[PDB]
Design a protein around this ligand. Structure first.
Ligand SMILES: *[C@@H]1O[C@H](CO)[C@@H](O[C@@H]2O[C@H](CO)[C@@H](O)[C@H](O)[C@H]2NC(C)=O)[C@H](O[C@@H]2O[C@@H](C)[C@@H](O)[C@@H](O)[C@@H]2O)[C@H]1NC(C)=O
Ligand SMILES: *[C@@H]1O[C@H](CO)[C@@H](O[C@@H]2O[C@H](CO)[C@@H](O)[C@H](O)[C@H]2NC(C)=O)[C@H](O[C@@H]2O[C@@H](C)[C@@H](O)[C@@H](O)[C@@H]2O)[C@H]1NC(C)=O
Ligand SMILES: *[C@@H]1O[C@H](CO)[C@@H](O[C@@H]2O[C@H](CO)[C@@H](O)[C@H](O)[C@H]2NC(C)=O)[C@H](O[C@@H]2O[C@@H](C)[C@@H](O)[C@@H](O)[C@@H]2O)[C@H]1NC(C)=O
Ligand SMILES: *[C@@H]1O[C@H](CO)[C@@H](O[C@@H]2O[C@H](CO)[C@@H](O)[C@H](O)[C@H]2NC(C)=O)[C@H](O[C@@H]2O[C@@H](C)[C@@H](O)[C@@H](O)[C@@H]2O)[C@H]1NC(C)=O
Ligand SMILES: *[C@@H]1O[C@H](CO)[C@@H](O)[C@H](O[C@@H]2O[C@@H](C)[C@@H](O)[C@@H](O)[C@@H]2O)[C@H]1NC(C)=O
Ligand SMILES: Cc1ccc(-c2nc(C(=O)O)cs2)cc1
Ligand SMILES: Cc1ccc(-c2nc(C(=O)O)cs2)cc1
Ligand SMILES: *[C@@H]1O[C@H](CO)[C@@H](O)[C@H](O)[C@H]1NC(C)=O
Ligand SMILES: *[C@@H]1O[C@H](CO)[C@@H](O)[C@H](O)[C@H]1NC(C)=O
Ligand SMILES: *[C@@H]1O[C@H](CO)[C@@H](O)[C@H](O)[C@H]1NC(C)=O
Ligand SMILES: [Fe+3]
Ligand SMILES: [Fe+3]
Ligand SMILES: [Zn+2]
Ligand SMILES: [Zn+2]
Lengths: 423, 424
C-alpha cells in the first residue's frame, strides 16, 4: 500500500554473478580523510577488497575490509561488506571498485575540503525516507537540486522494513538498492530512529538495532564513543553531533557522559557550524508524537544553549517545522517557569521527517501555532543546509509538489558564535 | 573516609578450604516458588550444586547451577555461583547447603505464602547501603526491628566499590561478605543504581553494570523481560515492578515497551499492592541530585497514575522523603501547568536512600518545604512497608540515632484500587 512494488525499476538487481549491490558510503574518520565503503553480495561471500584511486594521481591501491552476516527470524542476510579507505587527499575525486573477484562495479566520490573556518559546504537533509512513491520523488528532488548537496544528514527511519510481516528484511535489501543511486556517490550521515530499533520479542528478536547496525556502519570510535548510536564527525566548516533518541541518556550513562565531554571538544574557530542530529524532535507542535522529546530535552537542552548550537535537526514527525530560537531551561518544579522564551543563544529546531515514509503525512497540528513555532507544513519534501561562510548559512525547504528549484520556506542562519544577530 | 577497614569483623572470611562466601538469595520466579541461590568460592571453582530440603518433609534434594568469573581492569574475580531452586512449597521453611565438595555451609529461608488478596507481608526498604559504619548500623536496625522484615526491597547503590581506585572490586567481595548475615536468609530484590553502572572507558571497561550483573542475578525472564535491569516479581499480595534509571526508556525501547505491557498484566484482584522500585527519585526536594528524575517522570508518571500505583520507592538521594499523593501530568509546553497538584489517584513517592553510603548524609534542602513534600529529614535509616490486607498497609521509617523499635515517621497507606480514600 503506497510502498513501491518489488519489481519497481529502483529495486532492480545489478546483473552479473555476485554483482555487488546496496552500495553505500559514509565518512570514515573524524575529519574527512577516510570513507567507509559498504555493500552486499548475494551469491557468495566474495572479496571485501576495495580498489580506489584519484583521477589525478591515478595510482590504484587496495583496501581490505570485513564480511559479516545475520539472521532475523526466518530471514538470512546476504554477505555484507564494510571496508575503510584512509589517508585520502582533501577535495579530490576518487574512483572506487567493489566486486573484485567476480563482477566489478565502479563508483566515485569527492572528498570534502580540509576542515576550516570559512569553508563552504552544502548538506542535504532527509528524514524518514522509506520506499513509497513519495520517497522516490523526494530522492529525485534532492538529486535534481540546483544547490547540489554534497552530503546527506539522515535523521533516522531508513527502510521501514519493520512494518512488514516479521519485518521482512528483504525490504532492507530493496531500500539499499533503491538509495544506492545517491549514497554510492556521496556520504549519508546515519542517525538511528525508532524504526531501526526492531525490538520484537514475540519472534525472539530482542537485540536493538540489529539489522540496521549490521548494514550501516559509522566511524564512532573516531570520536571516542563506545557505541555506533552516538558519535560526531567534522566536515568542512561543520561539527556534527549524532545522538540516539532510543539509547540511554540518563546522568552517568555512556551517551550522556560522551556528549558532555564531546561538547568541550568543539572548536568554533575551526568548525563554526555546530549541528546536532537526533531522531525525535525536542520541539514539535504536531499532534503526532507530541512531547515525546521531553525526556531528552530535560537532559540536553541546557547544554545546547550553553554551547550555542546553531541548529538541531530531527525527523520522526512526518511533516516540516522550523522553530524560533527559544529555550525552556528555567523550570525548577515550583517556580512556574515552564514557557519557552526568545533566546539568542539557543539553536533553531527543525523537523524534517517528511521524505515519504510509507506514504502518509502528519497533518494534525496543535492549535493555535505556538509562539515557539516559526513555520510548519504537512507536505512531503527535504531540506538543504547551505554553508556560505563562518557567519551565514542558508536553509531551504523544497516540497515534492513544487518544482525542484522552488523553496517553500527558506531562512538565513546567522552563526551563534560568529554572528549572533536576530534571524 | 568512613568506610569500614578491610580487617573489620563484618568482612571476615568464613573458615575452611574453599568455604562459600558472599552467600545471597533472591526470588527465582514470578510468584515465589523459586529462589536463586548465589555465592563465591575463592580457592577453587567448586561445585555449583545446592542441597536443600523443607522442614515439613525433610527430603534432601540437589539443584545444579552455573559457575562464572569476570575481570575488571587488573582485578580477577573468584568463582561465582548461581543456582535456582524450583517448585518450592508456599509458606514453608527451607534449609539449603552450599560448598558440597569441600566446606559446607547451611542456611535457611521461608518461602512467602501463595499470592492472594489479603496475604499480609512485611517488606524492608533499604537504599544506597554502602559499607561504612553508618551502613552497619542501618543493617543492625533492620535485623533488630520488631516488625521483622521478610524481604528487602533494595533501591540501588550497593557496594560503592567504584569510589575506589580502579573501582577496586575487592570492595564488592567485602560488601558481599558483610551483607550475607541478612541476604543469605531472606531475599533482597535488586534495583540497579548509578554506582552499579561502572562505566570506565579510561581503563577499558565500557560495559555498563558488569560487576553488578555478574554478582547479582534476577528472575527477569519470568516476567518476559529481556534484561536484568527491569523486571517484575509477585510476592504475597504485592506486584513489584523494578525499573532501570540508567537504561533507555524512550518510546519503543525494550524497557519502555516492557513496562507498558507489564502494567496491563497487573491483576489487582490477585495482588492489590502495586509497588515500583527505581534508583533516581521522580519527586525530590533536596539539593543533591535535584531534578535528575525529571526525564523518567515525563515518560512514566502518567502511567503510574493511570494504573494506580500505590507507592514508588527510590534512593540515590542520601536522606528520607515522603511525598503527598501528587501529579504533574497536565503540562503541554505553553499552558503554564507545570505545578504539581494533589492527586489522590497518584502514588506516594518515597526516597529511602539513607542506609549509610560512604558515611555522608544529604542535609541541604530546598526551602521552604514544597507542597508536594509531606515529610523529609536528613538522617540515616531504613523503611518498612507492612501490608496488613488488601486495603491497609503501614509504612514506617526508623532512624539510626533512635531505638530499633522507634518510628520517626509512619503513615497508613490506603490501597489505590480497593480503598481509594484520602489517606493524607
Ligand atoms: C558570508 O556570506 C554571506 C552570504 O552570501 C555574505 O553576504 C552577502 O554578501 C554580498 C556581498 O558581500 C551581498 O550582496 C549579499 O546581499 C549578502 N547576503 C546576505 C544574506 O546578506 C557575507 O558578506 C558579508 O556580510 C554582509 C552582511 C555584508 O556586510 C557584506 O559586505 C559582507 O561581505 C559573507 N561574510 C563573510 C564574512 O565573508
Ligand atoms: C592494580 O593496580 C594498582 C595500581 O594501578 C595496584 O596498586 C598500586 O601498587 C603500587 C605498587 O605496585 C603502589 O605503589 C600504589 O600505591 C598502588 N596504587 C593504588 C592507587 O592503589 C594494585 O596492587 C595491589 O595493591 C597495592 C595497594 C599493593 O598492595 C600492591 O602490592 C598490590 O599489587 C593492582 N592490583 C592488582 C590485583 O594487580
Ligand atoms: C576438597 O574435597 C575433595 C573431595 O570432595 C578432596 O579430594 C579428595 O580428598 C580425599 C582425602 O580425604 C581423597 O581420598 C579423595 O580421593 C579426593 N577426591 C578427589 C581427588 O576427587 C580434596 O582433597 C585434597 O585434594 C585431594 C586430591 C588430595 O590431595 C587430598 O589429600 C587433598 O587434601 C579437598 N581439598 C582440600 C584441599 O581439602
Ligand atoms: C485491614 O487491616 C486494617 C489494619 O490492620 C484493619 O483495621 C483495624 O481493625 C482493628 C479491628 O479489627 C481496629 O481495632 C484497628 O484500629 C484498625 N486499624 C486501622 C489502622 O484502622 C482492617 O479492619 C477493618 O477496618 C477497620 C477500620 C475496622 O472497621 C475493622 O472493623 C475492620 O476489620 C482490615 N480489614 C479487614 C476487612 O479486616
Ligand atoms: C569468481 O571469481 C573467482 C576468482 O577469480 C573465480 O574462480 C570464479 O570462477 C568460477 O569458479 C571457479 C572455481 C571456476 O570453476 C570457474 O570456471 C567458475 O566460473 C568466479 N565465479 C564465477 C561463477 O564466475
Ligand atoms: C507511528 N510512528 C512512526 C514513526 O515515525 O516512528 C510511524 S507510525
Ligand atoms: C555533582 C555531584 C556530586 C556528587 C554526586 C554523588 N552521587 C552519589 C550517589 O550516591 O548517587 C555519590 S556521590 C553526584 C554529583
Ligand atoms: C523513481 O524515480 C526515478 C527518477 O525520477 C524514475 O526514473 C523511476 O521510474 C521512478 N520509479 C518509481 C517506481 O517510481
Ligand atoms: C517466512 O515466514 C513467512 C510466514 O510467516 C513466509 O510466508 C515466508 O515465505 C518465510 N520466508 C522464508 C525465507 O522462509
Ligand atoms: C557491626 O554491627 C554488628 C552488630 O551490631 C557488630 O556486632 C559489629 O561489631 C559491627 N562491626 C563494625 C565494624 O562496626
Ligand atoms: Fe518515521
Ligand atoms: Fe547513593
Ligand atoms: Zn520515527
Ligand atoms: Zn545513586
Amino acid at each position: 500500500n503506497r510502498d513501491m512494488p518489488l519489481d519497481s525499476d529502483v529495486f532492480r538487481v545489478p546483473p552479473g554473478y555476485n554483482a555487488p549491490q546496496q552500495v553505500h558510503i559514509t565518512q570514515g574518520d573524524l575529519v574527512g580523510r577516510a570513507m567507509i565503503i559498504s555493500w552486499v553480495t548475494m551469491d557468495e561471500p566474495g572479496s571485501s577488497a576495495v580498489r580506489y584511486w584519484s583521477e589525478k594521481n591515478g595510482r590504484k591501491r587496495i583496501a581490505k575490509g570485513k564480511m559479516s552476516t545475520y539472521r532475523f527470524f526466518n530471514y538470512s542476510s546476504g554477505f555484507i561488506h564494510h571496508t575503510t579507505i584512509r589517508k585520502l587527499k582533501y577535495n579530490t575525486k576518487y574512483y572506487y571498485e567493489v566486486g573484485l573477484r567476480n563482477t566489478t562495479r565502479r563508483f566515485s566520490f569527492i572528498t570534502p575540503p580540509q576542515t576550516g573556518l570559512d569553508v563552504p559546504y552544502t548538506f542535504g537533509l532527509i528524514g524518514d525516507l522509506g520506499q513509497s512513491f513519495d520517497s522516490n520523488t523526494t530522492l529525485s528532488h534532492y538529486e535534481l537540486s540546483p544547490k547540489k548537496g554534497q552530503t546527506v544528514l539522515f535523521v533516522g527511519d531508513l527502510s521501514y522494513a519493520d512494518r512488514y510481516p516479521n519485518h521482512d528484511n528483504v525490504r532492507w535489501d530493496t531500500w539499499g538498492r533503491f538509495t544506492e543511486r545517491s549514497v554510492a556517490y556521496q556520504p549519508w550521515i546515519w542517525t538511528a530512529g525508532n524504526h531501526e530499533i526492531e525490538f520484537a520479542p514475540e519472534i525472539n528478536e530482542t537485540e536493538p538495532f540489529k539489522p540496521f547496525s549490521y548494514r550501516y556502519h559509522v566511524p564512532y570510535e573516531a570520536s571516542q564513543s563506545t557505541s555506533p548510536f552516538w558519535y560526531s564527525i567534522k566536515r568542512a566548516s561543520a561539527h556534527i553531533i549524532v545522538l540516539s533518541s532510543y539509547s540511554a541518556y540518563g546522568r552517568g550513562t555512556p551517551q550522556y557522559t560522551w556528549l558532555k565531554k564531546e561538547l568541550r571538544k568543539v572548536k568554533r574557530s575551526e568548525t563554526p557550524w555546530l549541528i546536532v542530529l537526533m531522531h525525535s524532535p525536542l520541539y514539535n507542535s504536531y499532534n503526532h508524537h507530541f512531547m515525546e522529546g521531553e525526556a531528552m530535552r530535560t537532559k540536553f537542552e541546557a547544554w545546547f544553549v550553553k554551547y550555542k548550537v546553531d541548529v538541531v535537526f530531527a525527523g520522526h514527525v512526518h511533516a516540516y517545522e522550523r522553530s524560533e530560537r527559544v529555550s525552556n531551561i528555567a523550570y525548577k518544579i515550583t517556580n512556574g517557569l515552564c514557557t519557552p522564551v526568545k533566546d539568542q543563544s539557543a539553536p533553531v529546531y527543525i523537523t524534517i521527517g517528511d521524505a515519504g515514509n510509507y506514504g502518509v503525512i502528519d497533518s494534525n497540528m496543535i492549535q493555535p501555532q505556538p509562539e515557539y513555532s516559526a513555520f510548519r507544513e504537512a507536505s512531503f519534501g527535504h531540506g538543504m543546509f547551505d554553508i556560505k561562510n563562518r557567519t551565514h548559512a542558508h536553509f531551504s525547504w523544497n516540497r515534492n509538489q513544487d518544482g525542484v528549484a522552488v523553496e517553500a520556506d527558506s531562512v538565513w542562519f546567522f552563526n551563534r558564535h560568529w554572528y549572533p544577530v536576530d534571524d
